[PDB]
Design an enzyme around this catalytic site. Structure first.
Site, mmCIF file in Angstrom:
data_model
loop_
_atom_site.group_PDB
_atom_site.id
_atom_site.type_symbol
_atom_site.label_atom_id
_atom_site.label_comp_id
_atom_site.label_asym_id
_atom_site.label_seq_id
_atom_site.Cartn_x
_atom_site.Cartn_y
_atom_site.Cartn_z
ATOM 1 N N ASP A 154 27.567 6.495 -32.940
ATOM 2 C CA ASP A 154 27.060 5.105 -32.983
ATOM 3 C C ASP A 154 27.401 4.383 -31.677
ATOM 4 O OD1 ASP A 154 26.066 5.319 -35.717
ATOM 5 O OD2 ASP A 154 28.032 4.714 -36.484
ATOM 6 N N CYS A 195 8.533 4.368 -1.552
ATOM 7 C CA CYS A 195 9.451 3.709 -2.547
ATOM 8 C C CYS A 195 9.685 2.241 -2.139
ATOM 9 C CB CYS A 195 10.780 4.443 -2.690
ATOM 10 S SG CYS A 195 10.594 6.193 -3.094
#
Lengths: 364, 365, 368, 364, 364
Positions: free
Chosen positions: D38, D170
């Site tokens: 979790d 980029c």
């Protein structure tokens, strides 16, 4: 004279600087520390940078006093060597610019006392600023700050005139004789520049502090006065007295000459076979330099102010050697400063010409 | 006692004789130097909202209101011991009221989401102490600087008592503590003494009420707390709760404290070291001393002082002070190892305390 | 007569006899002292939004809702054990509901970008526990202080169940966990006990749904999670998931839990130390105990109590408690080395737990 | 096949996963790390929570690559074990959600290049996002991101068409062959899903990168190209070459088959009597894994893509043992990950079915 | 020539780079440090990213000098190797873009002096920027920044023409010869590109700085000038002198030729049997490299500018070995940089073709 162990120069050489019209090599090396290195030297820039104070861990509340004590010493440098007068003037310009930065006065707002550090009270700050405006103009002959000086002098005169006791508080309801002594001296400097008589209020002030605020037998001022209750904090303070008597000597030499020998009897411990001295901060203790820890350093200045070469020498023998000074690339540093305001106060004491002599500074 | 016990600064006889001799002991003077001497860092330097003195001793925010109140109660007794220190004590009390009103002190009330006004309702822990300080300041100084605020706060407390079905006021909503009530009721005795009013009349209903679900009469001890919405009383007895409450009540109804005091000692006080020392258990069913908030022994030192119990005072101070390693440097008092919260405050108060009844009877300046 | 095992505070026999003797053990009383005693830092000091108790034990923010809820579950059982403590349990439960509503507890919902309202939709992890706590507070106290909020939250839960194509409600968008559903469904049984409604009728469809792809029936173990957008079931079984779910389902359908419990033990429980101790594996295909969130053993202790399995309760408590070094100082309980999150909470709840069915059937309080 | 020292499974077992329709226990334990616990497991929630990356100390600029590489591995898991295809699709849905969080693309704004990460340039981010859109839809058959996928594919196609060099930069003026290779592969995946011809632009791009951008003697790409100035940085990069050749093998196998022997000759150091290999990042050095430190990890992926079992074994014998893997509670951890993107790239290499085989993924 | 201990290359090899039309392998490894690694190399991106400077702990106030020193080096790399001229142009594009980021100039505002770093004063920033604009255009022939260059040159010319002293200040009232030397050189570069006569102001500047600002017998400039007071800080500065004489030599070679041998007499200490040299920062000390600690590093550049191979060799033997250089993966690093701006100033010194040669740079 013999050079004592760990000392940089003899007491004789400090006292002979003005007559020789030259600062000692170690005082010049202090001026190098103050002026030499880009960005981190305290008098690098008029801007609101405090790198020099951040590197020495100066508490914010004490920066106003660091700047003022450097300024008082630069005034004496101006009088000792005419060749350094231009540089002392430039440093005093920076000292005043920095003194006006909010890093310096900002505790007044942060403590919830107001947004304007000049308006009322806060004599700790505006007392030093007003004396620095005056000293800047004696050294340089510049009217750069005259408008501000004229204004601050009148606010101080008006506040004195309005108050039922003689003088001005710091915080609301906190009266200290040492912060008042600077404000009154600031009026003497204004009068010297302008031909005014603001200094007339001084007589009522010296009458007032000789009643409730001093123990005349011990030649020592009580810690503080609080007008709302009329309470006097019932402990005598050596650093309070040393500072007050030093400044008052420039205004009423008889007053400080009356109390100085009782002050020494009350607080000064001579030790190491007469070679050294250290100063108790209060009565009923054997301990040296308690409280703010500045009794011995303020007494060094008072000894210089009073012409006491023996106690000057004894105190500097106590203060300087364990701080381990050295000169690296012709610049002075202390490995183990023993107190707040350490390089400042040792600088001021080595060069101090007397508050009276600064008042009478000849023009450039 | 007249021999100086090991590690002690002054004899028990010396503390108890201060008022007769009209002088504080040198160690009490050295505590007043701690409180007043050093620029900016001394607790009573300025009326400003600076708390440097409390930051340096790591006082938790929620305890600062108690530190200021306990200093204030001590300073009121100093005023009574030595007329030459009365003006200083007035000055310090003026600073203590000013600081008590700073949001650093009362701000937990907002931050806990209970409201933005710390006096409006409930919060008797804070405003009970403030109201007692307003009164003690005016008894010491004869100044009316705070009378408008004092007149207002007294009426807010009287109104809240009158409106509740139980006798007294809660702290946090639904949290009732006898010790915080005891301070509020004492504040009404002080107002009445100054003004000739009868706010103290509600005391009898309170004293009747706390002797029901809230005390164990046999063990002479108060339960930890009461919770009116649920009717719950927390089922543990608390020495520090009991010691503080018996001390303050002894000022208003001495017979009440005199009845429970000997049973409180039997329940909680451990005498050790061949009778030379004592330490106080915080609750029943334990051997451990000063559990919980850790203040049972310190508040019992105050109670012993209030009840005139020189033997227990000596025993408790022999336990508390020596291990704290006091020293006086430059005529100022410091503890190297304070054993608890509120340590110098509670040792100062206990050393000088003239009795809450004597503070109520304090002559004018 | 029963022997006190090494490092234990009280026998398994003493914990199981509390309800019959109508008194908590001294160590349980000392835990209620920890929870209630010291000004400001005790967890049930004030109904205010102060979390000093949880700061001091380093409780992660996300776990505070679980810590409050597990305290509440224990306190409900305390009310049942000792009538004299029922008022104190009621007061603590009033405080637990108030703190449960502080944004410090529910705030993660906004912080993760799921929404500004913690109860509107989804987020069953929070509002299941809150809805169950509303119910238990009212069972214990007989107080209608929260009836308005309880009626609202119960209907939001029933509506969301009714509106989903799977049986139950998600936590995060698209994260379905059987354990957080079991709390939500148990909250409907408690509302029904209080109001004579039939919200619990949806339980049947839920018990059929969680026994399709969400369980391995042979190992008696639930899979970690379901994700309705993809229809994926994460293909690992979880002991802590199963232990929590079976304990709560046992209060609603005891036969369901009675069926899977022995398979759950064979799958996950390692008995060691000559039969004196036990520790629980979190998943299949490992020898390691208490992996994952590390709560398998502590949730199995609660399950053992719920199923009346005194032997496994004793073995698990012999594994969990002695290494945590309990001590009672001034009549208050402390662990030097808590082995896990929610450590004092889950040991408190296991020691007192009367069964979720017994909590459902709690008699109303005696009048003022 | 013998299990080498410190390995979890044989090269034979990794390469036989697809034939056996099952992942190795160690790949299953990696999927457990990715999915089990979790809140701290990287694939716990579709929310903008990055606990898993905070605990591994992933640099912000690298999170986009960590998500993409997990996604590329999950695509192959889908192909290896039909029983795990729903899990992989779920994980890919989370991968795409997380990829769109500002924590992942926000460097584009921080660096002052824009507030919209897909608008123009920024191919590193949007090439990986576009490929992830396509791989999610091949694995799941879900049209959940189809609108976004259709828009991003056209924005990429438009930018290629409008540029005088083949490809997209980029940062402005920074061209990298390896970030172009991902963008072009994303066009092949969109075309496989929609029957379009966006991949047509690929031949021009392969013609281009074989001129100024490659060293044909060494089979290696130069670090980068810079259009405004025409500069090609004069250093060859192994990690650049390995990644580029791996992706191009899915589009034009003969191209990667042409350079692969030269690439190995230039960069790959066989050591430990033929048992291990490590990869030099550039020419003129003996040192392994300089620069970004990913030459060996991207060469492990390339060896997998090219079916080179010998070099795969040698590289994994170098990379994995020193990282001290262990499986605690059926979940994989490394005590000493030797590089950024370590568990991501070892996962991908262990499972990778080939970019061509991902292109041909049969529907669910 | 023998390779001295700890050296990467001989002094003969540095000085023969231009004649051989190639940089030494260590200079190429410095260029690889400057360019190679994604995100952390200083010349990775034109964007406002400063990771390279974070990683070496460059003080904020020093970043402008780091960029400019790299720029001055790259200009000489352009001249040495035609094959590296485009890479140098690309780096200079980035240097100018980064120079205009607020991380670099922001101290002007932070110190309370203005919000616009080029409007007035602040010659330390805009002198360097203006020189960089010009050097970019000499190397590339690009007019990308010509609008800004034409604007900034005119602002500098107008402010010189407006002042009663020759030149411009840094902070208000802080005049430094070294910062002016950069501004005047920027005008020579503008005039070379445009056929203008902005450089005509140089003669008045060279006349002004030889009055109170120099000790002509010691060949050394005083630390600073402060026009408002007219103070000259009374300490000579080696680092101030070495930087100033280096830049002046490109404008008035006779000026630097006259002072250079007096400068070396005043500050330079030859030690280790003639093999090494270190530079004292001021008069009246034996200590080397006091103050900002750059005396030796700047004297290395001045030796290079003056063609003094012997002193270059001696200084590099003092500076380089203790810093423990290594080449890892064909990239240069220093374990123990001895000073601020260390790799910057040793790079520049190694490649420096002379400011006069940069002025005369032939077109691409």
């Amino acid at each position: 004279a013999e050079l004592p162990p760990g000392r940089l120069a003899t007491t004789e050489d400090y006292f002979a600087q003005q007559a020789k019209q030259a600062v000692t090599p170690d005082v010049m090396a202090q001026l190098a520390y103050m002026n030499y290195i880009d960005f981190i030297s305290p008098f690098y820039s008029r801007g609101c940078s405090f790198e020099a104070w951040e590197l020495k861990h100066t508490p914010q509340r004490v920066i106003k006093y660091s700047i003022a004590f450097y300024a008082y010493g630069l005034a004496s440098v101006a009088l000792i060597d005419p060749k350094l007068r231009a540089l002392a003037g430039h440093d005093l310009d920076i000292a005043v610019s920095k003194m006006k930065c909010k890093r310096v006065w900002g505790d007044w707002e942060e403590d919830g006392f107001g947004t304007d550090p000049i308006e009322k009270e806060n004599i700790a700050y505006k007392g030093h600023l007003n004396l620095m405006y005056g000293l800047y103009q004696l050294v340089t002959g510049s009217r750069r700050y005259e408008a501000e000086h004229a204004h601050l002098t009148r606010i101080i005169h008006d506040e004195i005139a309005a108050n039922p006791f003689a003088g001005i508080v710091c915080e609301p309801d906190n009266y200290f004789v040492q912060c008042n002594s600077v404000a009154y001296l600031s009026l003497w400097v204004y009068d010297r520049l302008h031909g005014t008589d603001y200094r007339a209020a001084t007589r009522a002030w010296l009458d007032f502090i000789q009643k409730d605020l001093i123990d005349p037998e011990r030649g020592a001022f009580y810690l503080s006065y609080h007008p709302e209750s009329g309470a006097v904090k019932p402990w005598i303070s050596a650093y309070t007295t040393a500072w007050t008597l030093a400044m008052v000597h420039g205004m009423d030499p008889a007053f400080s000459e009356r109390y100085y020998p009782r002050f020494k009897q009350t607080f000064v411990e001579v030790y190491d076979e007469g070679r050294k001295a250290r100063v108790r901060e209060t009565a009923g203790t054997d301990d040296a330099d308690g409280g703010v820890g500045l009794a011995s350093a303020f007494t060094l200045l008072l000894a210089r102010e009073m012409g006491d070469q023996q106690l000057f020498d004894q105190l500097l023998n106590h203060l300087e050697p364990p701080a381990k000074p050295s000169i690296v690339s012709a610049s002075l540093r202390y490995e183990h400063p023993g107190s707040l305001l350490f390089d400042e106060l040792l600088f001021l004491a080595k060069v101090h010409a007397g508050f009276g002599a600064l008042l009478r500074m000849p023009p450039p």
